[PDB]
Ligand SMILES: Cc1ncc(COP(=O)(O)O)c(CN[C@@H](C)C(=O)O)c1O
């Protein structure tokens with residue numbers, strides 16, 4: 066794959082490897098690591114992160130919906146995969162054939178699938194229990210038992226696991242976290258037999274209470290080197306290595322005279338003779354307009370973005386005349402300066418999770434491993 | 448193409464056709480229409496909109512950078528394409544071979560390209576003039592004349608056109624617009640000869656002053672049925688037809704008792720016994736967290752989104768017990784209610800342009816033409 070615009074994201078796979086390996090060391094020998102690679106691996110490249118994670122110690126993968134699981138299969142991933150979200154009963158056969166575990170939380174969904182599927186491949190289900198997140202999952206014992214009965218009844222339906230998800234595992238105060246954990250323990254009693262796989266922990270929970278993880282944790286955000294929250298940053302067991310960085314290059318350089326305006330709405334005016342640079346990145350690439358008063362790194366120095374951000378380009382004020390082709394870093398480090406995803410997240414007034422996911426399909430991903438470029442992934446490549 | 452998650456966007460190509468056709472009628476028989484389809488056609492599907500546009504009266508296409516043009520060629524589009532942004536001198540031969548016109552605005556670029564390319568295919572260049580936008584383009588006559596000389600000199604370099612872009616054509620006050628237009632007329636005098644294609648108008652300018660468009664207009668936002676701005680909405684010549692709509696379905700329905708919390712941070716509490724529904728769409732699909740206090744349409748009624756929006760799902764408060772599978776409209780109309788892209792943009796505090804572009808690759812696009820489903824485009828399809 067090759068690209069023809071001087072704008073690209075870089076993904077350090079050694080960092081991802083280190084982040085997962087350190088966790089493997091942290092957890093008991095019998096606890097499995099299921100790497101969460103939904104949303105194209107939080108914007109980092111699904112199959113590249115999946116391969117690295119499995120290499121570092123993970124044994125299973127998790128995605129959001131069926132399409133994402135099939136894509137990994139097509140791309141050659143053979144490890145077990147669990148779909149964390151909902152799916153259509155009519156799609157049970159397809160999941161069964163591709164060896165994809167499904168989440169289940171309604172007895173009527175199973176009633177429907179039973180009538181549609183009848184072997185020969187077994188379908189592995191993971192029962193979802195709502196302990197206080199309010200998203201997905203069973204809530205009462207009557208429904209739980211009904212689900213287990215329908216599963217037991219069908220010769221090809223297998224209950225491989227059961228889990229829950231925490232709503233506040235990343236807050237310093239553990240009041241609600243404790244309530245959910247306790248609720249989980251109480252709901253587990255409703256099962257006639259404990260499935261081979263019981264899980265509940267995400268990145269925050271597993272990094273904070275590794276002894277309360279059962280037999281499998283679902284490692285997401287922390288795998289990419291990002292803290293589940295600023296609050297627990299100081300409570301993390303080992304230092305996380307950030308893997309994502311974003312860059313571009315100056316495609317135009319010019320000097321403005323005082324009074325000259327820049328960009329849409331002509332909201333910016335040159336107060337004096339200043340140097341303005343143009344870079345090939347805009348909001349269609351995920352660099353949202355709201356970042357208008359942010360800055361970028363060029364020649365090891367911060368350069369403020371001036372005027373409104375455009376769909377594919379934006380302008381910055383330069384220290385002086387720099388040659389066209391000069392590298393600009395939007396997320397990453399240059400010399401002694403650095404811009405982290407957390408910085409950008411602060412400016413956009415959101416969480417770090419949302420940032421890598423918004424960097425669109427338009428931006429190619431360059432992968433590094435062993436300090437060398439591994440491959441280039443251009444979504445709209447030829 | 449097929450998809451396995453009940454979340455999808457719908458693109459009405461008949462609306463796009465009408466929007467372009469009405470302009471074709473509005474403009475002089477000699478004026479070309481260049482459809483702007485960069486950024487995957489502002490998130491509507493590049494090749495689908497390009498074909499419909501050409502069918503309705505456009506004769507040329509415009510994209511942001513080389514990769515987007517090559518993708519159209521691979522997909523079978525044979526009409527002329529102009530790259531509006533920057534490109535590498537080393538890529539001139541490739542653009543020449545695929546018959547892609549390039550924007551030029553620096554003489555040093557041309558000096559570099561001349562030394563690299565030497566036929567046999569001619570390269571058509573469009574000279575960009577900065578008249579007050581401050582983005583790309585030449586500024587002084589000395590540089591302009593140098594560009595023309597280098598082009599004239601090379602046997603395979605051809606100056607097919609020249610243009611500028613307006614920073615405020617969508618504001619009711621035309622003071623700056625008038626200054627940019629006047630500056631353009633003065634800079635055109637720097638050319639020893641007028642190229643066969645002179646253009647300057649975007650959607651707002653062409654819809655407002657169709658007689659001041661020269662021989663080609665670059666039709667973008669209005670082609671998608673979106674007003675360049677709320678201010679000029681009442682100044683438009685004909686009514687625009689919105690083409691983008693977004694939908695999903697309830698995948699879970701449950702009743703909450705007072706005091707029960709919902710989603711991350713447990714920031715929402717059920718004040719009474721209320722029905723909560725879960726839908727398979729989140730911020731990784733372009734439905735940003737900031738939309739947390741917005742509302743959606745279900746069963747012809749507005750239903751508020753409650754609690755934080757998740758990466759792949761979010762919850763809403765329902766009127767009562769609705770069956771799973773019930774359709775939810777995020778952008779579009781249901782009964783007497785309607786949510787436009789303009790409504791979503793207001794809540795996100797941005798402009799309509801940014802909304803369809805942010806709806807990610809994860810969301811399949813279903814196309815309609817002649818009141819019938821034409822095709823389905825699933826980016827991560829099998
Ligand atoms: C069921 C489930 N398991 C594991 C994870 C991984 O969480 P971490 O990345 O914090 O480790 C998430 C939430 N994922 C977030 C992105 C969401 O749905 O908004 C999840 O939904």
Ligand SMILES: Cc1ncc(COP(=O)(O)O)c(CN[C@@H](C)C(=O)O)c1O
Nearest residue numbers: 375376483531612649650665666667668
């Ligand atoms: C050079 C050029 N021509 C035509 C257009 C089409 O403009 P309209 O969509 O308003 O008709 C744009 C701007 N496009 C916007 C999206 C930008 O760069 O932010 C452009 O960059």
